[PDB]
Amino acid sequence: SDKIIHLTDDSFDTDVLKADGAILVDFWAEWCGPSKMIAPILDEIADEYQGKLTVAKLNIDQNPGTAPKYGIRGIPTLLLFKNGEVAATKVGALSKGQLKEFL
């Protein structure tokens, strides 16, 4: 899905916090199986929820700075931002359907 943003640490404040609309941030890692597992589901969501929402991955190996600033405690964690502050959280692998986050 060519609708997903790949981030870096310094890239974060500009791309998700001071960004309008709803953004879903995937805190992922290559060595975490459940990350690899939910990634294609995130592709399909980037398609099906376009214009309602932008998903955006963030490799915590290549970008170890911004995951601690938000106190993530397990991988994967999905964080839903609405206007700079964190609206929703969901940790762990989850199914196709379980992504019934709020709206």
Binding site: P34, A67, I72, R73, G74, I75, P76, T89, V91, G92
Partner: protein, 209 residues
């Protein structure tokens, strides 16, 4: 967790004093089933039925050797029957020779916490009994510290994944590691279509915390 839910020392099976015959080479990589090359180290884990676990570890780059066995109980040099009776106190475990220069103990810990359920008490998956319990057996103080801290972090991760269960993993200094019968060594490589437990609750242990 507490030694009281095992067999009592007085009831454990007496075992024998002569060690299990062990093959010379690992069935997959041709490495020594016993030797530890200079600069390499051992890790010992229990993650449930130990076929799938041994395969899980020998596939990691940096693991020199793996071996299926029995540890943490009372009975010296047990047999699979004996361990399966529950009357040995051991857990089905796996002994890993790895190179810290290629794979670190922290990464082995990540694999551990990711590929089984550490909060099931005296079972793992569909297999019931104290021989399937979750355990980490440090061989050095550095491993002891690393493993106990990782238990801390992963319990927190479980809470973040909105899981209210408390970790049932045993952590104790390593006692003698008794090798399993030759049939079980590299079992899933000898029998590709055999049983490997589903693992993991679906959460991973983020680094360095």
């Amino acid at each position: 967790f507490d030694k009281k839910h095992l067999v009592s020392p007085a009831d454990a099976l007496p075992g024998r004093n002569t060690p299990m015959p062990v093959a010379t080479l690992h069935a997959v990589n041709g490495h020594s089933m016993t030797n530890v090359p200079d600069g390499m180290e051992i890790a010992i884990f229990a993650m449930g039925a130990f076929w799938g676990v041994e395969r899980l570890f020998w596939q990691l780059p940096g693991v020199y050797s793996t071996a299926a066995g029995y540890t943490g109980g009372y009975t010296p040099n047990p047999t699979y029957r004996e361990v399966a009776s529950g009357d040995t106190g051991h857990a089905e475990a796996v002994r890993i020779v790895y190179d810290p220069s290629v794979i670190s103990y922290e990464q082995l810990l990540q694999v551990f916490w990711e590929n089984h359920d550490p909060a099931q008490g005296m079972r793992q998956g569909n297999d019931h009994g104290t021989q399937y319990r979750s355990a980490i057996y440090p061989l050095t103080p550095e491993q002891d510290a690393a493993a106990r801290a990782s238990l801390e972090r992963f319990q927190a991760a479980m809470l973040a994944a909105d899981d209210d269960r408390h970790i049932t993993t045993e952590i104790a200094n390593a006692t003698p590691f008794y090798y399993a019968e030759d049939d079980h060594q590299q079992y899933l490589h000898k029998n590709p279509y055999g049983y490997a437990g589903i693992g993991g609750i679906g959460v991973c242990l983020p680094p360095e915390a």
